[model samples]
Target chain A: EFPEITEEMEKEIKNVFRNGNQDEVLSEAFRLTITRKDIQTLNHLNWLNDEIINFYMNMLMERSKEKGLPSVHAFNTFFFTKLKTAGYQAVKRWTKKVDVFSVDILLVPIHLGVHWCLAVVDFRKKNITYYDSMGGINNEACRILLQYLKQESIDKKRKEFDTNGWQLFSKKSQEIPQQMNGSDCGMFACKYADCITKDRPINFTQQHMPYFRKRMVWEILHRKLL
Target chain B: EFPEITEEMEKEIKNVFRNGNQDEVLSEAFRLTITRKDIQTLNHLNWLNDEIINFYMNMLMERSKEKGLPSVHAFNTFFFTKLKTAGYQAVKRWTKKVDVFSVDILLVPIHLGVHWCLAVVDFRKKNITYYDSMGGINNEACRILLQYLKQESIDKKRKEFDTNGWQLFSKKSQEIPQQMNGSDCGMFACKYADCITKDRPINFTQQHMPYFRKRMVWEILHRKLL
Candidate 1:
């Protein structure tokens, strides 16, 4: 949430999506522009579209560069699907700009047909964690992400990813709170990234949803972290 | 939303669902408390069960009775389906206590298999209104509700429902805001009743959902209107 300096500012921030100026950049350095359609889609159905998710991920990446937090690269929603189906060569273009091994954390936003989940590759932690708000366990997603990490290292760093002592797994567990409602999976994913990137405890529960929704609007409007 | 007087209170309120107290309220009230299994069904894959919807309707009914705003009678989610197939006589027991025509507002929590919507009969407005979050318009629902009013008048008051200045309508033209996501339909239905019963404007939007979710935990925990 950008600093809501006043009631009027908060009110304006809340209406930013409704105004449909999501792409405008009031702050150029932050890359904080939210897509109007994504806001429209998210605000209307409470589902975050791929564009919105990617944009948010990119914002996390950009902000971490300055804040001394571990670097994070949020892949597009289709990253895992494309990598799994078409192999490394097909997804090579996706990592054209950056080397995956350089980032401390890699964020994969997974979209199942009806819900959203997150998988994180932490080089420091040497673990790939999958977070599903619905308490869904997806070890497959974790394994696939690890496979992608190896492939990306071969492509970008000209070597196989070191597997010396890495422990990676995915499951519906206490690492994240199990969501008690249907539509909050995406919200939980975003929150997961927010907490993990900052090394904060994932202490929030489903009751925090309302506050998250309002704070998200402010974040999207300002194109900045709350 | 409750006053949320203290952090401790809010914390306890949020715990109500996790604590499994929802079922305990069933027999204490009108036997309308929804269980954990009911919530699990709704939260998993994001589908609202008929039991959850029905229980929410009863909560609204009970709350309205306490507040003295506008007396409301919330029919169970199955009310419409039974009325359609079995006819009014077979389902008359559902409305045994309250005379349908005597209330200021009549709430029909309509369950359409995978989705849920609402139809409201406002005696003061002389209007039968249908609300769908997914941009659905149930003209038939409005018509049937109006018909139910006519039948109830003859059954309870020994006269025809006064059609002198009544209106029935259903369409996608802003009677209520359309939902953007698949899951929040039930939430919208309940919020609609919460606002209209007090004659307040529907000032909330999708951004308010997370807050509503948390507030609803408190409302359901206390089994009262906030």
Candidate 2:
């Protein structure tokens, strides 16, 4: 059976929408804000924007802090764009405080115009993977991240990032649940990161998007993931 | 030295943009139209739309018809979208009049929201390749086109497509030029197809994008490739 959003949770989500306070701050954590306007993007058939995606990613990072889960670092939605456009020099200072190697997983949300996808850098598994709900490939993004890791290690750890036994790839469409509609891509990207953070198999499909969307509203409101 | 757009060609492109006739067709060939607005999209920093992409693809098809070049078939920009969303059933009729196996190369323009990439099926080389200006890996697209070829052979040729010796891959960033900016993806896709159709190495770089853009305006207007 699919995960269910309790009736109470649904009513609360509806209240947020019906309250007509889109500008009202619903929740704030991880140096991010979730306004009602951000939550409303999860409504049926609506394409998600940056605020909602970044907030959901923050929730994933928070969930990773729980016992037995791998530690995670979720970059903002714009990280990939900045990295791809300006090269390593642009994003080199982003991890000024945190040592990326200390985290077990790094979640990079990629915003390709009109589409949403996720790229994961798994320190434990020794792989950098791009996950596209539409099955698009982005190995270049993986390589860029790998190159960034090399530069970061040099700048921070004063050592070379080991490249041995590492693999870069895109998740095959058949291996992952492919999205059926345009609007669900953001949800798919978020859910993909959620599963990866827990080291769980990605077991959901397009049918789960709506439930996930509704459930995300509850999760974001609570500043947690179900 | 890069391909040069002559002064006369530059003036002609400027005239198209300044004529105030967005809808007036400047050129029509291969059952596709190029209007002033379509040519205008070639202006600096403008993200190309489907019209310009489709017209440029048609030019590739027309170029393939030359005496020494490989016979080529270029699908419209929407082909990948339809095939990915609905599966093979949606695009099976697309090749009703064309024998895809008879062509030397097949160019599939991939529209990934804010990005553009190209997938090529090379019968002569025995490989299916995905080319992205940003060096994105798209083995899924290559696989999808391979599956399409398998289905096309069964439906139209009354036989299964032989998969032996046919490799599916995305051109690694090192193997091809990578675009440095976002707006140049469409031009890269078109230029990638331009080279592949002629069996030439993809040797262009980001430096060539502006020149390529202006040259494309001239090429589409003349229904030819410079």
Candidate 3:
């Protein structure tokens, strides 16, 4: 039988999904959760308790996919992606089957990083035919240290620089400026030639295709679990 | 015209192509490059020189290949790659056409980073397929990395406090770590699973099959030619 997943089920996934971090908060929390934890409270649990639930969820989803009960595609788009819990829940319920399972583990957040400093330069052709890889939240001023991670939210980007960098004491800020600047340079670009997700115009579509820096969310979900 | 090219042109490339850098060196190099005027000036010239050479080598090769010049498939052999100038020179001569014009420049090496670093990790079962995509050496360490990375890839996305972190200090070493750990996190495990090139991995061949990381040396060259 297919399991009926709901938007509520999707919303409660953070703890149980096992996103990449093995942070201190989650580490301390895992110590409290017990053996024999099941799916019902898995989403509700914190830290280690949540981990135990995720372990079960991951293992179960893995088995389900191998058995072909639920297809990997359904699992990727529905319950296991960053698709607002509502969409995921709706999709999950529609596709649930006892033997089939989705790539639920992949549904967890896969926070990425970016190099905003490098975003200031336009490195390719001067032609209009070139597709912009780093077409921006704001077109200019991208050279400043900024982030291309997790959101199109320019407000959040401005907010982060203002609060974190601007708020630090002068001594700390002075010491940090160079290090942070260095990191901005290092963290931003990849071995691939074209990395947009920044502000400078990255030429994407050429007869010579640059590496695909960012993959589709579903593509990522499909990759991890399956 | 059949876009002139010759074995001599490829041979001439030996005089131009050079060394590879480890991650420690490159990270520092990349940092200084974007920020420091002196570093940028020197590197920029070298880069321009590099790109020009690459563009010529590639153009010549593509032209030669079209007219039925044999590809130097085994030119990528392990110890032979170190011969650098000699080996590639021989291969270039082997691909020469009698009337073809001199190659404008040596191209492939610059576009593809250090030929020393251009290795590929094929994540397929049954046969362990591997190659140095760059025009040089592929070795034992890279082999170990491929094996380790493949194992990591299967369970790559699941959170693992159990896994020790990566400490890659060279390009090859950093390749696996940057993909699975650090910025990419769980998401890259599948999406970028078998990617050999730094920016993009080969499609994750979960069920869709044949997802190895393919790097485009030519695209990299073209991207750098701004």
Candidate 4:
């Protein structure tokens, strides 16, 4: 059910599962692989794919707990892909957690075609901000996110979604430098959430893509955000 | 016969062409075809593929010509791809310009595995900067780039490349927050160039990928930079 056995999984993972109980090790490995596509069997290339993104999202939630940081909820990469055509009804099931509103930040990774970008709902700030390395402005994404907030509030809080002093901003004019190409969108989205959750300023660019890719692979395989 | 001019091609592109180009455009429009793919006869999608990335790079060069900015030399995506395996020799042709040292900035987009990152040789700054949304560090990349500069200077200027005050650093440590996902590396690369070439501060984030995608589509279509 809930796979949080850090003590055993961590040590077994490093040993290729040969010295440990095979069943437990296999199950642990299977648990780390949230989706079939994450297997990286062959020709996986460097794309975040859906499996890696969702797994990373979960790791973020878990790590945020250890760090005593703001509570974060990262939606899977496909949330926006389907939302574009399926609308609220299609995604309402995704936010079923009774604990949704308690989070300080709700992360939405939007996939515009194949590219990945990020949107954040900062509860304390009462604002929703969009971050794109390409310097894109998607107020609509923020608005859509705000609408999601309203719907969630209605569903969870038994009240109207308050908008008295909320802000829906596309940080286009004064955000980080925009990305030049397509493939790094997912990287940008995750980093945006990582920085915002830690209250750290966004301070990276694309030259670090190679190292980041390496780091993410290591982080994901370990199922930790460090 | 190639379809170069926009008169009949545009009309055919707009209407009856909509039927065949219609389906093609619908699909090709969805295909994310930027260079040959921008030919919306078959499909299209939101992602900016390599074709688009390369075309946008060239357009930046052209736009640099019009804007009276530094003469920017934007290398193709493979410029750094082969640079990794082939070292300077693989990318030697890219800098065969008789006036190589005369350029203000040189842009190199590196494709690592499937991810894309960027490195810049700002002659004016006398430094090399690597931009990766993932907050990666590749001092070697910058160093190799510096070597490229040294070689280009030796070839073109018949003199040693000056490094008295040169600084090579990954924006990862001091500048921006690193990207945390596998995608968007390319966008970070381009935007780094966009901002640096314009001498504007990098001021955007991952939330902007959607608008950047649209903006890039428009820029590539018109063969101009905004």
* Candidate chain B TM-scores, in order: 0.84, 0.96, 0.21, 0.76
Which candidate leads in DockQ?
Answer: 2
TM-score, every prediction: 0.48, 0.56, 0.19, 0.46
TM-score of 1: 0.48
Instruction: Give the winner by TM-score.
Output: 2
**DockQ of candidate 2, scored on C-alphas against the true complex (2 decimals):** 0.14
Kindly report the docking quality category of candidate 2: incorrect
Q: By the TM-score metric, which is better: model 3 or model 4?
A: 4
Residue-level lDDT tens digits of model 2 in A135-179: 767778899999989988999999999999999999876899987
DockQ of 4: 0.04
Better model by TM-score: candidate 1 vs candidate 4 = 1
Name the weakest run of 10 consecutive residues (lDDT summed) in model 1 chain B.
B19-28
lDDT of 1: 0.70
Instruction: For model 2, give the interface RMSD.
Output: 8.1
Which clashing pairs does model 2 show?
Answer: A113-B114, A137-B137, A139-B137
lDDT of 1 at B179: 64
Displacement of the residue B52 alpha carbon in candidate 1, Å: 28
| CAPRI grade of model 1 | incorrect
